[PDB]
Each structure stands twice: as structure tokens, then as C-alpha cells.
Subunit: 121 residues, 4 copies
């Protein structure tokens, strides 16, 4: 179920995700990406489902980062959807969608999809 979601997590690209999970299902924190048109920290907000089921399943959650801060504005946003699994080795396994603002003409290629796995290691 929910619990040790709060913390500093890192993914395979070396990005850093620092989050706080509130008792009612809210997620707040900052994100720093190791790749892309990004630099320093960005604000993130999400939600996680605070009453996961009791057949050892993961806890579903998701969050968003709009890539604008006081250093850069990449006119895009990424949303990560996945589930947390705690235990000896806790992991957050996600799939994400990165949409950039385009003109109608380029709207067909506005969205990248990928997957990231986060650990506190």
C-alpha cells in the first residue's frame, strides 16, 4: 500500500524526484531532469490512490511537471502514470507522455512516450 513514497528518488537517467505524499492522496515536490531542455528544479503536483487494495499490489499514482521555471521554459509538460511498490527495494515503475506545444500542423508529432523506473538509490 501507500507509505514510503515520500523521499528522494532517482531514475535510470539520473533525474531526481523529491516528493511528499499527503495522507489524503496528494503528491507535491520538485523534479530535476538529467536530460532535455531543462535545468535546475521544477514544481510537480500529483495524486496517488491513499487506500490501495489490501493481494500485495502496487499503489497507483501520477504527477505532472510543466517545464517552465525561472531559468527555462521548454513549452512542454510531462505526466508520469505508474505504481509504487515498497519493501526492501522500493520502486516506482512509470510510463510518461511528454507533450510540447505545437502549431496544428505539427500536432501529430507533439507527444513522446517513454518509461522510467525510480529507486531511492
Amino acid at each position: 500500500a501507500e507509505a514510503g513514497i515520500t523521499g528522494t528518488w532517482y531514475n535510470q537517467l539520473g533525474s531526481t524526484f523529491i516528493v511528499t505524499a499527503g495522507a489524503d492522496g496528494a503528491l507535491t515536490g520538485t523534479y530535476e531532469s538529467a536530460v532535455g531542455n531543462a535545468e535546475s528544479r521544477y514544481v510537480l503536483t500529483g495524486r496517488y490512490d491513499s487506500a490501495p487494495a489490501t493481494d500485495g499490489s502496487g499503489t497507483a499514482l501520477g504527477w505532472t511537471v510543466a517545464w517552465k521555471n525561472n531559468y527555462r521554459n521548454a513549452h512542454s509538460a510531462t505526466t508520469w502514470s505508474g505504481q509504487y511498490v515498497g519493501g526492501a527495494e522500493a520502486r516506482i515503475n512509470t510510463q510518461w507522455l511528454l507533450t510540447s506545444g505545437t502549431t496544428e500542423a505539427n500536432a501529430w508529432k507533439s507527444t513522446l512516450v517513454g518509461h522510467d523506473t525510480f529507486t531511492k538509490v
Copy 2:
């Protein structure tokens, strides 16, 4: 888009999205889905990139809804990633990922993908 995004929006399935965009790039609201293991409203939170470009580009944004409220708990969460295009007929075009909590064995089938188009209602 903060004034332009704020409002009531509906999508092709008949689901309702009520949102407020804050000066800081924040999006907060409630979502009511016309389909699925959902009932009543659910809280949503997201962000939108406040200073787009001039030009006729869309404003990127995204939000999340964990499908748990006082009436139902579906143990899943959906994230919508898309762009807002304003105008007389403003629209928000998105693609979404719906992940259900699963055992490690069934994790390969935990995520659904789709796309929704939202139309804003007057006011």
C-alpha cells in the same frame, strides 16, 4: 491560458472537467467520468506551461486524477498530457495513461492508453 483554461469542459465520452488555472502554472479542479469504476467527483491537480509562445502554438499542460473519493476506490490513476488551443472554439487535445495497481506478475497489463478531446462550455 489561465483565464482561457479556467472553466467547465466536457469530452467525447460525456465526462466533466471543472478547472481553475493559477498564475503560478497550477491547475486544480474536479473530474467526473462518464465511464469506468467511478462515481461522483474526484480531485485533480496539474500544471500548465503559464507563458506559452505567440504564436498560434498550443499551451502544454497535464493533470492527474487518482480514482479514490468517499464513495469509491478503483486503485488506479489517470494522467492526461495535451495542449490547450483557445479561440472562439477552444479545445484541449490529450492522450492519457490509466494505471491500475497490480501484483508484479500482472504489471505488464496495468496501463491503458487513450486520447480525449475536451470542449469548453460557455461561460
Copy 3:
């Protein structure tokens, strides 16, 4: 759907899809994209699940196009996964993944996702 799928189809972007469905569940044809780093026709191959169900369910199918022909090489490939719904107005609703070849460092940005709806033309 083998007779129903066989034909010329166009999607919202103005791209052409000419296909033949074989008794064995095979799909073979050519694709012409209205957008992207593409020119002329490209070969496509796919499969479709020949014995659907009775009922008013769609026929699942999917196909791939590697964007290389005698005129252009974009070093990318797109796969479309969707369902065929026949009737007077038959449609093929799909979601696709377009992967470009990259270095390991840029692999995180190698795949685009989208959705296309195709309309069959008479004959």
C-alpha cells in the same frame, strides 16, 4: 474483415493506406504519408485477428511501415494498433508508435505516440 478490410483507406492527415487482407490473417500493402520525412509509397505488412467474435465487436489488427524506400530513408518505423469496425461507414481506429533510431543517450526521446482514424473509400 478480409474483404471488409481490403481496400483504400485515408486518415485525417490525408495519408493513404492500400491493403489486402489474406485468409491466413495477413495484411500486406503500401502506405503514403501526407506528413513527415517521407515521400512516395512504403511497404506495409501486418496481421489481423481473421475470426473476430459476432457480435458488434471490432476486429483487432496492426501493421508496420519502416520509412525507407528508394527515394528516402528516415531511419524510423511506425506501428499502428487498432480495430476495424465495418458497416456502411467502416472505420479503422488506431493508436501508433513511431520510433526513430537514436544513440543510447537520446533513446529517452525516440518514440512518438498518436492516433489515426481511417475511412474506407468506395470501392
Copy 4:
């Protein structure tokens, strides 16, 4: 570039992918999944781009499997889109879409998305 794509590959679920790559860009073979409403082998057909670029990049490719054979018909099809990287440890990194045939009513939940990594180990 292209080359040792032909062979028997296995993914993290233990599924087996046996493919033959033709000199003009065709891929043919069989697929056996370790999970899902599937059993025994299924026919697969795909394409790979036979002239990848010369900045050590992967070779883009994709293939499809309709899940019907003489044992089962799951009324679905999966398409894998990704790139091959050869070398000491060759890998095929993909993202896939699994669409099941549904009624219009259930069309919103007809497609699963996931990612698989294949090795010859």
C-alpha cells in the same frame, strides 16, 4: 546498423521471439508469450529500416502478432515499435500497444501499452 537481428530473443517476461530479417527490410518469425491469453506459437510479420544511419544509432523496426492460432483466439493484436542495438550485448528495446476487439461502448479501454526489452540470453 542492421545485422544480428535474426535469431531467438527472449524478453523480461520470458517470452520467445524467433525472427528472420530479410535483406530488403522484412521481418518474419514466430512469437510465444509467457503471459496472457496465449499458448504455443503465433505468426509475426514486421519491417526494419535495412539502411540505418552510419553516429552509432539503433536500427528502427516494428512487428505485429494477431493472437489467433489453432489453439486460441484472444481477439487482439500487439504491435512492438523499437530499435535494435547490436554489439557484445545486443538488445531490442521496444514499447508496445495491445488492442483487443471491443464494442464501441468499451472502446475507451481497448488498448494496453507497455515496454519489453529482448536479449538473446
